[PDB]
Amino acid sequence: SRKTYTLTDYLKNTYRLKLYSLRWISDHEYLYKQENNILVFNAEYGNSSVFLENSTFDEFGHSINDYSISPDGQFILLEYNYVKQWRHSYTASYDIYDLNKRQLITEERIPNNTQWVTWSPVGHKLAYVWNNDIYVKIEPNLPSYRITWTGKEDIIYNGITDWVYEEEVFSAYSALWWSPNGTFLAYAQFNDTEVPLIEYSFYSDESLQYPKTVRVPYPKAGAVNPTVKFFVVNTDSLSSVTNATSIQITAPASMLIGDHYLCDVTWATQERISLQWLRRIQNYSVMDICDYDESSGRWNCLVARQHIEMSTTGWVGRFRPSEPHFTLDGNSFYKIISNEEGYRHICYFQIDKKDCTFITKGTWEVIGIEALTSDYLYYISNEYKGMPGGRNLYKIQLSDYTKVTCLSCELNPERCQYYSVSFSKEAKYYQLRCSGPGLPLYTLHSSVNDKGLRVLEDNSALDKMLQNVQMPSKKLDFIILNETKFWYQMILPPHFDKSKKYPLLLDVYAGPCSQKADTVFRLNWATYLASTENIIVASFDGRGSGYQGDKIMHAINRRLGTFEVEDQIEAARQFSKMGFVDNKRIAIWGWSYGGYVTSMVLGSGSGVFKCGIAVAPVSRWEYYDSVYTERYMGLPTPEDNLDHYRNSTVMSRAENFKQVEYLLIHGTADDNVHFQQSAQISKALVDVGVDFQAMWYTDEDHGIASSTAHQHIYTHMSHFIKQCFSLP
Amino acid sequence: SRKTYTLTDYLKNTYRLKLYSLRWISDHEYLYKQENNILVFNAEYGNSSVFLENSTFDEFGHSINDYSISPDGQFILLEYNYVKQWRHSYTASYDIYDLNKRQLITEERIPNNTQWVTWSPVGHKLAYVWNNDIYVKIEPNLPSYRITWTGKEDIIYNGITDWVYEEEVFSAYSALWWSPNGTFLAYAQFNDTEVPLIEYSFYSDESLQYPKTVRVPYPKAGAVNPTVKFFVVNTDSLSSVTNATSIQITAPASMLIGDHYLCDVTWATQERISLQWLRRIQNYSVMDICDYDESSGRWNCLVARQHIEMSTTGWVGRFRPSEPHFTLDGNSFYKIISNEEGYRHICYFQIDKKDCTFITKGTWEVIGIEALTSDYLYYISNEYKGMPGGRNLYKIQLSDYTKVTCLSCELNPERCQYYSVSFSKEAKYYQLRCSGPGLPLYTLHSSVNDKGLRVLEDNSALDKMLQNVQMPSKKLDFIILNETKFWYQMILPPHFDKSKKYPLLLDVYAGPCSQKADTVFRLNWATYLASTENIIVASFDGRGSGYQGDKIMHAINRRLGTFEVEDQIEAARQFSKMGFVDNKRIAIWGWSYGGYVTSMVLGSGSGVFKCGIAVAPVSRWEYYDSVYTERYMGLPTPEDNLDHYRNSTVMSRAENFKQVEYLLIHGTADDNVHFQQSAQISKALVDVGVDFQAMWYTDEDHGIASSTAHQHIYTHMSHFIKQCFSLP
Ligand SMILES: CS(=O)(=O)c1cccc(C(=O)NC[C@@H]2CCCN2C(=O)C[C@H](N)Cc2cccc(Cl)c2)c1
Ligand SMILES: CS(=O)(=O)c1cccc(C(=O)NC[C@@H]2CCCN2C(=O)C[C@H](N)Cc2cccc(Cl)c2)c1
Ligand SMILES: *[C@@H]1O[C@H](CO)[C@@H](O)[C@H](O)[C@H]1NC(C)=O
Ligand SMILES: *[C@@H]1O[C@H](CO)[C@@H](O)[C@H](O)[C@H]1NC(C)=O
Ligand SMILES: *[C@@H]1O[C@H](CO)[C@@H](O)[C@H](O)[C@H]1NC(C)=O
Ligand SMILES: *[C@@H]1O[C@H](CO)[C@@H](O)[C@H](O)[C@H]1NC(C)=O
Ligand SMILES: *[C@@H]1O[C@H](CO)[C@@H](O)[C@H](O)[C@H]1NC(C)=O
Ligand SMILES: *[C@@H]1O[C@H](CO)[C@@H](O)[C@H](O)[C@H]1NC(C)=O
Ligand SMILES: *[C@H]1O[C@H](CO)[C@@H](O)[C@H](O)[C@H]1NC(C)=O
Ligand SMILES: *[C@H]1O[C@H](CO)[C@@H](O)[C@H](O)[C@H]1NC(C)=O
After folding, report:
1. Which of B252, B364, B528, B604 is most buried, by CB atoms within 10 Å?
2. Which loops or segments lie on the Extracellular side of the membrane, by the record (chains A, B)?
C-alpha cells in the first residue's frame, strides 16, 4: 500500500508532464529554452550553445510573459502587460532588443495595447495591429507605416478577427499573412456594423460600486453576419510621403450572390495566393488562386483556376475546408477531401486542370498533411490496426503512390500509439512526439533514411514518481451498434477486480467531429476519481463523432440533439449490463457541447442515470453562434430548419428531470455560451417544479480557469458525485 | 393522530385567513366587496344596499384588476392591462363608467400606459400621470388639460416618484396631493439627470434570442441623488386658451444649503399645506407651514412658523419624520416625537407658538395617531402589560391628559393582543382588526360610548379546520442581556416535551426598527417547520430593534453589522443553554437585511451555528441605496464613516465560512438588492477555497414572489435544513 492520486494532486499540479517545445529557425537548427536560457541546437549532430543567457534581462523591470526572435536572429521581441480577451485574443506591451548591440530600442516604439504583432517570415520586418489598424515597420528602429485608417472599436477590424471569426473560423486573433518572401502582406477586414450585441454584467473587484456592462458583437443563429474584404500590400513599395495602397481581391461571383465567409488563406509562392470562400449555407466552397501582375501591380484570379468543394450529405470540411499544400513551383497542391465513400483522403490537384487524383484510400482517414518535398508527402493518419483513436506518421512516394511507409508505428508499439510531428524547413529533420498510451516521448529524426538520432525528452523523472502512486489504467475497445463499430474508453481503478461492482461516471462531449475515446495519456479529474474514489470513468464515441467517415459524422446533419444523445444512452445501457458496473450508480457529466448532451440525456426519461453535472451547457440552438450552429442546423426559419431548432431544447424536457439529481453550473461572464443558456434552463425547471442544484461562478468565462475557480468547481463537483454514489 | 401542517398546506394555501377589507365613504357608511358585488353599509344599523352588481361588466372584454369610485358615487374607474413595475409602481389602462347613464364614456379617454390616477377627495375631478407629465380632467367626458411639459422617461418625474423615493421615502408611486376641497393639486418633481444607472440582464421567455438590459436610475451610498421641487395648481382656474400656472414652494434656507429630501406632505385645511424636509445627513428635519393668498394667488411659508426636529443620538423618526395630524381649524396639530428619555410619544404643537407639549409618557411608545375630534385623540400603543410586541387602541381625553382609556385591551384578552384600526370620517365609527395571538377578528364599534356593534368576521371556518390539524404554539418572553430586557419568540412543535431535545432555527431580520417577536398569528414556513419537522423556530429583537425607545434603537447608529449581529449570537447562545434545545443542531436564516445579518453571523466564527441560509442579502453597504444606507451609516467618505463601511462587509469574513454550511440565494432581476451583492459574496468564498451551496432565480426580483419561484425556493430551503438536522 502506497499513496493514491488525490484531488489536490490534479488541482495543485503535483505531477507535471514534461514537454520539448522547440523552434525551427532553419533546415537544421532549432531553439529550445533549457531552464531559462535560450539554446541553439544542431539537428544533425546534436551539439548546442547559448543563444541568450537567463540573465540578459535581469534589470528589465517588467514581468516578461513571452518572446519571439526574428527569423535572422538579429532581434528579440519581448511581450509584457498581457491582458486576455477571448480564447486566442489578447493585448500586450512590446519591446525590441537588438542582439548585435546588446541594448533596448528606444526610438519609435511599438504602442501599449497592441492587439497583434508578427515578424516577416524572413528577415526582420514587423507588422502589428493597434486600435484595429495595421502598421508596418521595415526596420525595428525606424518609424512605422500606416496601412489602414478605417479601424474602429467593435465595428471595423483590420488585420484582426472579430469574435465569431476568432472562435469559429481561424482559431486566431490574427488576420495577417506574410508572403514567404516577406514582400507582401495579405490581410482581411471585418465589418460588424449590423451585428447585434450580447450584453452581460461584469462585477469586477469589490471596490466597484456599480457593475459594468460588457457589449460584444456576436451573431446568434440566423442574425446578421459580419462582412469580409481581402487585401494585399506591396511592402517593398512603401514610402512616408505617399499613403499606402492596398489591392483588394474580391470573392468569386458564386460567393457575392449572398452571405459568405472567408475560411482559408494559404500562400502558394512569392507571387501567388490561394483563398477559400464559404457560402453561408456551409455545403459549398470555392478555392480561388490569384497571381500578381508585375506590370500592373494587380492580382488576377482566373476562372480556370477555380476549384469547387461540395457536400450533398452535410457540410464541407471537418470544421472547415482543409488547407492546400503546394509543391514548390506553385502549379499543383495536395488537399484532404471526402471521397466517393465519405472517407477523408489526400487528393492531388493540378492548378489549371479539372477534378483531382486521390493518392490514399481505405476505411480510415488522413488526419493532416504535415510536410512536402519533391520525393515525399508526409501525413498523420489513423490507419494502423483500424484504430480511429490512434495516430501515426506516414510517407508516400510521389513517383509511385503504392509505396507508403509508416515512420512511427513500430518505434515504441507499447508506449506509443498517438503521434504528432514538427518538421524543419525543407523537411530535412522532424521531431516526433507521442502522447500515449504511455508517458510522452520526444525524439528527433532525419528524412534522408528516417534514422532516429536522439531521444530529446522521455519523461523519466515522472515515470519513477508515478511508480509510487496507485495509478489507474486505461482500456480502449469498441461495442457494436446496428452492425457498426463504435469506440469507448474506461479509466479503471487500480487493483481493478472484474468480480466487484464499481459506480460509473460517463464523461461526455459528443459534438460533431468529436473524439473522446483515444490512446492519449491524461492526468485529469478522471484520473483522481478512478485512483482515489474507485469510480470507473467511461467515454463513448457515437454517431456524429469524428475520424471514421461521413456516414458516422454526417448522421447528425440537421439533427443535433438526436443520435449523439441516443447513442450516449445506448452505450451506458451496455456498460450497465457488464458484470463490473453497479447499475444503481451511473452518472453523466459534460462541459460545453457535453453539458448540452448531459442535460438532454438527463431530461430523456431513460431511467439509466441516477445523476449528472452540466457545465456551461448550450440549451437552445438559437442562442449559440451563427457560424457553428448553421454549419449543422441550417437557418432557424419555417422554410429551412426551425422545426428541429424547436424540437431540441433542454427546456422542453423539464418534466423528466424529476427522475434524477441535477447539478447545473455556469460562469456569469461567459462570452461564448452565454449565462442566458443556463438561466433559461433553470427557469423551465422552476416553472415545472423540479428540484435541482445550481452554481454560478462570477466573472468567470467559459473555461472557468482562474486557479481559485478551477479548484472550487472540481471540489464542488467531487462532493456531488461522492454523495450521489453513497461514498464517504 | 391528526394530520400535520405540511409544506403543501403553506405553499398551496390550504388553510385561509378570512379578511374584512372596508372603505369608509362618509361619517356613517362604508363600501365592501361581497362576492364580487360592491355594497354600501350603514354603520349603526347594519343594513346594506348593492352599489354595483357582479353581472355588470360581463361584456367588458378585459379582466378588471381594480376599481375606484368617485367620492360622490357618480363614476367608477376600471383598472385593466395591469403591468407591475417596482414595489408600489405600476402601469395600467382605465375606463370610466357613468352611473346615471349606465354606459361607459367612450371618448376623451384616460390613455393606456397611465402611471397614476386619483379622484379628488370630493366630487369627480380627475388627476392622472401619463408619460411622466400631469393632466387634469374637470369632467370625465371632457378633454384633459396638460399641466407639465417637462416629463421625460428615467430623467424627469412629475407627480410620480422615481426609484429611491418610491422605496424609502413615500412608500408610494404617487407624488400627487389633492386639497381637501379639491380646489388645489399639489405635486412633486424629481430630476434624475445625474443619477447613475444600475444595469442588469433580463432573459424573458425562452423565445427571446438576445437578452434585454434593464437600466434604472439608482443612487448608491454616496452617489448623486435626485433633486426635488414642490408645486401647487389651482384646478378651478384652468383655461382652454392658456397653459396651467403652477406656483412653486421653495424649500427652507437650512435645506437649500446642501443635498436634501422632501419627506412629508400633509394638507392642514383648504388653504394650508404642511411640508417636511430632511437633510441628506438625516440628523435634521424641518417642518414648513404654507398659507394661500386670495389676492396674489401665491403661497407663504413664514419662517416663524417653522418647527425643527433634531437627534444627536441618531436619525429623525422611525424611518422618516412622522406625519402631523391637524385639528379641524388647522391652527394646531399632534405629531409623534422622540422625548427627553428616548421614548416616542405624542406632542401638541400650536402654529404661532415655539414649543410643544407631551400628552403621553412612560417606558413605552405610541405606534401611530389614528383619529382626532374636539374631545379625543385616538392612538395605537404598546403600553399594555409592558409588552413591546403587543398593540392596542387607546383614547385620550383632551381636557384631561391623565384620563386614558384602553378600548381594545379587554375585548378578548386571551385571543386579542395586536390591533389596528380604521376610523370613519369624523371618527363616528371604527373597525378594529385583531391579528393575534388567536385567529383574526374584525369588529365594528360606535365612538359615542365605545359600544361593540357587530362582529364582522371571526374566522370560525378556519377554527373548525384548525381543530383537525396538529398546530404549533407560540412562546413570547424575554431574556436578560447586560442587565436589560430583550424580547424573543419561539414557534414550538405540537406536544412540546421540555425534557426532549429539539433542533433550532433562528429566524432573523434585525434591521433598524424591526420587530420579529410579537403577538400576531402567522401561517408560514415556520408553521410547517414546527408542526411536521419538529424544529423550534425562534426570533429575537436585540439592539437596533424598534418600539422600545432610542436607547435600544439608536445603539446601531453609524455601526451596522455590529451589535445586532452580536446579540443574535448571544441570544442563540442563551437558547442553547436551555434543556430542550440541542446545541449540535442550531441553524440561522434571513431574507433582505436578515440575509446580511445571517451572513455576518455565520462568518463571525462563534461556532454556535451548524448551518444557515441567506436570501437576497446585502453584503456591503456601498452597494445599497443612499436614502436608507446613509440614514444609519452616514456618508462613505474618509471625512465621515468610510471606516465602518469597509469594516462591515460579508466578504471580509469569508475564511470563517469554513466552519459552517452556507446556502446563498438571489434573484437575477432584483432591482432592490442587486444580484451584484450576492455575486461578490460567492466570489470571495471561492477566493479563499470555501465550499458552499448556491441558487439563482431567473427573472425574479427581491420578493421571489412568482407562484412557481415561491414554491421552488421554500422547497429548496426545506431540503437544506432537513439534511442539516439529520431529519429523515
Ligand atoms: C470531445 S473533443 O476532445 O474531441 C473536442 C472538444 C472540444 C473541441 C474540439 C474541437 O475539435 N475544436 C476545434 C474546432 C475548430 C476550431 C474551433 N472549434 C470548435 O469546436 C469551437 C466551438 N465553438 C467549440 C464550442 C464552444 C462552446 C460551445 C460549443 Cl457547442 C462548442 C474537440
Ligand atoms: C422584521 S420586520 O417585520 O420588523 C420588517 C421587515 C422588513 C421591513 C420592515 C419595514 O418596516 N419596512 C418599512 C420601511 C419604511 C418604508 C420602507 N421601509 C423599508 O424598510 C424599505 C427598505 N428598502 C427595505 C429593505 C429592502 C432590502 C434590503 C434592506 Cl437592508 C432593506 C419591517
Ligand atoms: C556545433 O558544432 C560545430 C562544429 O564545432 C559548430 O560549427 C556549430 O556552430 C555548433 N552549433 C551549435 C548550435 O552549437
Ligand atoms: C506604455 O506606457 C508606459 C507606462 O505608462 C510608458 O512608459 C510608455 O511610454 C508607453 N509606451 C509607449 C511606447 O508609448
Ligand atoms: C461597414 O458596413 C456598413 C454596412 O453594413 C457600411 O455602411 C460601412 O461603410 C462599412 N464600413 C466599411 C469601411 O466597409
Ligand atoms: C339603511 O336603511 C335606511 C332606512 O330605510 C335607509 O335610509 C338607508 O339608505 C339604508 N342604508 C343603506 C346603505 O342601505
Ligand atoms: C389602448 O389599448 C387598447 C388595447 O386593449 C387598444 O385597443 C386601444 O385602441 C388603446 N387606446 C385607447 C382607446 O385608449
Ligand atoms: C435637471 O437637472 C439638470 C442638471 O442636473 C438641469 O440642467 C436641468 O435643467 C434640470 N431639468 C429640470 C426640468 O429641472
Ligand atoms: C492617407 O489616406 C487616407 C485615406 O485613404 C486619409 O485618411 C489620410 O488622411 C491620408 N493622409 C494624408 C494626409 O496623406
Ligand atoms: C356574483 O354574485 C352572485 C350572486 O350574489 C354569486 O352567486 C356569484 O358567485 C358571483 N360571481 C362572481 C363572478 O363572483
Report:
1. B528
2. 1-728
